[model samples]
Target: FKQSIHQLFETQVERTPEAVAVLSEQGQLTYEELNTKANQLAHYLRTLGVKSETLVGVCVDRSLEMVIGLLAILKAGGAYVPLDPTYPRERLTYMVQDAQISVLVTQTQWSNLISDYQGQVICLDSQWAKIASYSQENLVNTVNPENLAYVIYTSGSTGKPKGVMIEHQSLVNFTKLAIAQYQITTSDRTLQFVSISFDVAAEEIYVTLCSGATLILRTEEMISSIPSFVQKSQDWQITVWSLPTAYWHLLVNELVKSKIALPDSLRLVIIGGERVQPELVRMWFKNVGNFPELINVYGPTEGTIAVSLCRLSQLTESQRNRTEIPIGKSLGENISVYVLDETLKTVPPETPGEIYIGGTALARGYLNRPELTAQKFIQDPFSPSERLYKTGDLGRYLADGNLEYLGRVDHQVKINGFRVELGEIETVLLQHHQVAQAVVIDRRLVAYLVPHSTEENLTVTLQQFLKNKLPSYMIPATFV
Candidate 1:
């Protein structure tokens, strides 16, 4: 087994050089060509003083070159920090300064964004010749398994974004376990649906490449076009589709209403990133039947993509009735989970508490923020020398050992001496047949709902639907 994410790709490139590795709007690239291109870019990056542990900034759209740039950075033994072009100028400037990036790889259009940084900015389109001319040398450098691989920034509740640093081994272990859990194989073609900045994209790319599967990168417009995109890609034989629950709800509704059959090649549908409603799951199952697997995955970026997995086939009525679905058991071989209290003591089963994760998949720490890193990533008391990531999510183990999520601890707010879980109200509102989307906020008890059908009696029907599921105090004071 590969001990690092870089090694996983390298092994596949050697074994299946002619296999299609990635597809994007630009074009498809074989494993051999992708590795060679990355090698050339890595060689050039070395000439620009990039070395092991150096932070390289990657800013690009969802293009073939973007994937190439990421692999090149890893090949050069440097950690790549993604800079989304859509990020505000102030946030981008802060990230560049915080990570102290020495080199940046991006397209020509975004050059102005990083021009003020004290680094060399190389545009992939404009500097193609320079990268191609660089001589490739097999300069093998030793890297620790715990070395930082990437730093992903996420919006914090406190109004600031924080970077979560992931290690090479953590990615390696997580992807390996994910491939096994999902039964991903070389014959599978997986869709790249999420933004590259999100951790879901990390799993999509790494798992596909590492398993020698084909990665079909959907353009932003293509993804938005849903049914048309799936129809056009039928020839590519995409075997796996993954997206947030929001998109799945739309796709399933379209498929059902149009009486369109799911492609025979599709074997799995992976959903995450937000709370999933039971009604949506029932809709998908009723349409697709039991052929394609539906998986519910849960994890924070701090845990390196995914730490838990659950097959939707086993979901019970009671399990689906809860505010959140079961997040499943921990990934095999190198991961551990603990439901702990404020003092880090383990909580009893069925009792909601903060979820903590430990094992090989634990990330190194947050990039450049030692104090914050130390606070969240602490020494695992169960095992000396091992560290645990304190996931802010609250969960408890069911009688059968499945995990039941209870929403975020930090997101919980107190009103009139009663603790409120905003996600709980949102889940109930989403269960209403007329509601398409729901977002609940505790501040003044506001609820926002998007309707699927705006009939005269829809609002009254939804209110009656929630009345059956929630206590009087749990109902939102205002509905918008």
Candidate 2:
């Protein structure tokens, strides 16, 4: 049966009214209370002329109100365009104008930021009284699954940002697949550690709700408080935790120092949204002593959350011995992956090629940018009926069928008659004990390493590290 995101939430609420739905700093909200609150907000949005197909701008931090506002916008049959409150005013204004958002649902504190813009602003707390009398009524029934759910704007390396229009069905499909793959259930309590604006949040939010699991929203401070947060997982009996690799590194560091034991209730530690260093994973396993499942997922936002999943359980001793492990295989039932050359023809296994993804989970297209969309989303020659997104990433399929991500196509460059993958150097740098994060960018043969930690002898240390792994030509001519 086809169901929109709002409809799925409604079903869950009906089935589990007394069950805890959300745990935010404000307090815990039961499924029944959450539904009523969102209905009230949706009723208010309708009163303010927000109707089917209207694009409502949602600008707020990660909070319970953000979830309510998102659901409310969908409930009104309107698509939401999220704006990060931390973004500069210029960027915010550009996004508002780009999306042509006339109605903004925000907090009372952020009203000042949008005061200059000519838009109807609905503050969550302040508008509560005005919308209190509004009946908890469903405005529209049966929203088309193909309709736009949200527009997530990706920052271009250039100045302008492109809004990606994701449909309700794409997200619903992804949620269903993720729930089944992870074995989520009503008993599962998921810790949402990513910001709402990020694509990671889409997975954390939808997959949990779609599987009838409770979502626990962690504050910025709570995320930083590793010991307290880890303890709370046992206290609250959290079953699943999803966070970025950076935070996981910090939390694991604290755990090692404190000699903390692994929480028994935690069943999974899903990490992604950044490159996973093999060293970090090894260290985490060593410290935690392997209690929960560890998964490394890789996908672009254009692929609708995540398309690939690599369970750590499947890793061999040789694969784990490598500096960086494979990102695993495709998970979507309809998805197909191709490692193709510049001509878009499939390359032989063990040869690096651009990664292309095709499946039902693919997004509709970039919102209001047909030319750019056409350039990236092209017809699949192998499957004439389907389309494939030309992911700029480059990877090679191993003999065993696992895909080893080489690097971005752009990251490959010729230096001294030898092709160099800067990502390889960056991966080696991350393996160093002192370095927490590293980004290797190339200009000619020269490579720049932006290490997270400030170690004085980094240049000398890095050179020794490179000499052990890379050929002389692959080494950076200059480290800036």
Candidate 3:
């Protein structure tokens, strides 16, 4: 209901000033304490030229300062760009220069990584002395709802990552309503496990903070293993959990094999980013049952946080295998979904076409890429006032009004939590002298002939070569 995210966060701060907002191994921060730190940092960032729509880079360990830096950017009326510290130096440097980001918020440990760049660096670990000297007063709220709040970079088909700019309204549209729909309250202790760079984390952060609930940041060790995550979820008494479908599958497999149950406090579980496996759904039903509501959500990064939710309880076992769990209907207001043909006309029911999204939660398009923006974000034929983003995803409506998700209509696929383009890896393959023609498809990346050598370690050599160019997730897991 508040016009801005920080405005709503401020309201919660007033209502629960002493309540715990974020809990980490380092320490806990109350609503007032977090707000005060963010305000102080905002003042310093403003002096360093942070203003509306300014892209501020953040590369910090998942700590209280990470949260503070994000809040500080918004408070200073700038959009925060997340830079994963574990990412290869080449990728990080590329993003820094691509966004033309001049201000970077990092800590002492990784400070040397970006040392050459002559930009404003706020080292949260060592610069606390200087930051504490700034006034703790809140920055003047000059940002409108239309201002860019954050820029999330996803893998591009052309081999470079592109930043998608999300406005304050795009975030506000999803978090405000999802809180009510998911029945989130101050009593809920939610787990914030996803990386801040991913769009799904947007739902976990805003919905928890705005609702005056506690957000428990997971440690790197726990996030790395499924067994440890289950151990901590019970140890911490987690109530709400939002994870990628891939993680959910792993958790279900571990739970079934180990015969462990989640804490009773966890009543709501939401999973998305990839298709929800029918076997995974049945596995949960048989081993876990209905103690927690298993909800399947689907949407592109361009669709803010998410556009639809399909509660698993709504489908019977017979209906479960009928198709992939439906993406359900739109979750935000003023949003419309359509399965449009190549000509952009609506197809009949149970027809497979590209999924196009329009209305309230749509992003402003990729930053610094006007041609890509115009290509994907098209002017709406039905509503001239709004624009529709052409999601390369393919889906159709079931006979019962539920949306059945078909595979992607293009080469793009969501692996782990990262968007990967098959063509990108294929392009790297062509660079190898052995590989003349290459084709990457399915979950497997294969090279189609034109090999000059028949050496045994040649595959290993090619993999290591690609590893230097691609992220761990994008690298082919199997080669044959």
Candidate 4:
């Protein structure tokens, strides 16, 4: 049985050593070549005392080295922690400190970004000569299924971000389910679209790699421009794509308004991260034929990427007539989802309540936040030994047992697939010396400020200040 992520990848490598595994605008690597390179780096990482459960920070952009770094970290029996370079230094510094990772793999160009990080910095591009000096043979597997595989940070209601630690067991569960769900094959090419910081990136990378499918890494330009995205999908013959619901909405609008045809190579499109629009679905059905299936997935960072999915092609006419699309049943026997009230008792079908998820897909819990972990991940009422994660999202079951997502039970909102905590943004705004009090509203991310001192164009000034402390998405669109 393939228990770990790297083990599955290794099996694929042996099955097709010469197959093209990873592709990007810059370059590509065959399965064998990628394996050897990753083995060498894994050996080098071991020399730095990396072992089971160790966290290693990966701070590279979307490139081949990014894949190599992640696989090597897993091979070294260390969990990979993605540090998106696009994030502000303040945020990066906090993540590095919070995780307390001892080794950071990055490119020389981005090394200066975390210059003061007291940890060992290994630049993948410049230090490859040293990494290559180590053995290229596969190291003996020492990692356990229960060991952490990765730690992805998400927006926290508190001031600082919290790291959601996903173990090998949890990830492998999702990977196997996703592979079968997506019906991936060796001939398929999947586009790696999301930023590594998102758990969806983990799903895209591991699911494709482990299935022996070619992964086409997208460039920044392709992510921003629909035309570029389509051209690359056609040029690369990408067969599958996992996209944010908001992005899919934009693409559907563009396709209908511009009369652009769907990429002939695309056969499956998976969407998640927010509530999908029914009107968008109608427009898509009107414009595109039913050849390429569209699937909607749902899960939280603590639930290891996705635990539930809905295939639009399989929707019944009655179900399709609803105002909101159903998020579908649980992925498999290993996962269980329940709708509960404030008393933590299960509510009957069609009764709106908070969604609670429990299974092999649950994360190990937030890194270094014991109290919060215990608070969120509680004992399952039905099965006392099992722990259930309170999703804070409101949903109810359809008569057919599919989930109908209502909305969040809390203030958390998703902006373009990235979860944003209004409290986090408000906290960052209050950090400014000039600001006395701040409240951030949802959807528009509007910030209402009570300033201690008023100045000309204070909104512009506050925006500039926030640029150094928060990501562009977390920054308020308007300050009043």
lDDT digits (tens) for residues 370-426 of candidate 1: 887898899977678998889888888887788877777566543332334566667
TM-score of each: 0.83, 0.83, 0.95, 0.98
**What is the lDDT, from 0 to 100, of the residue 144 in candidate 1?**
62
Better of 2 and 4 by lDDT: 4
Best by TM-score: 4
| Pairs in steric clash, model 4 | none
The alpha-carbon lDDT assigned to residue 386 of candidate 4 equals: 95
**Model 3, range 1-480, lDDT digits (tens) per residue?**
437788889889999999899988679999999999998899899999999989999999888999899999999999999998877677788889999899999998998775378888889999988998888887776598999999989888776888999999878878887897788899988899789878888788889999999998988788677778878888888999998888898999998888787877898898998888888888898888877998888888898978888888767777777657788877855777778999899888988998999988799999889999999999987678889999988989877878877887788987775678888778777788877676776655454445666577777878887766677777776665
User: By lDDT, highest first, what's the ranking?
Assistant: 4, 3, 1, 2
TM-score of 1: 0.83
Clashes in model 2: which pairs? none
Residue 40: error of model 1 in Å?
0.3
Q: How far is candidate 4 from the true structure (C-alpha RMSD, Å)?
A: 1.1
Which candidate should be chosen as best, given lDDT against the real structure?
4
Candidate 2 weakest ten by summed lDDT: 412-421
Lowest summed lDDT across 10 adjacent residues in model 4 is found at 312-321
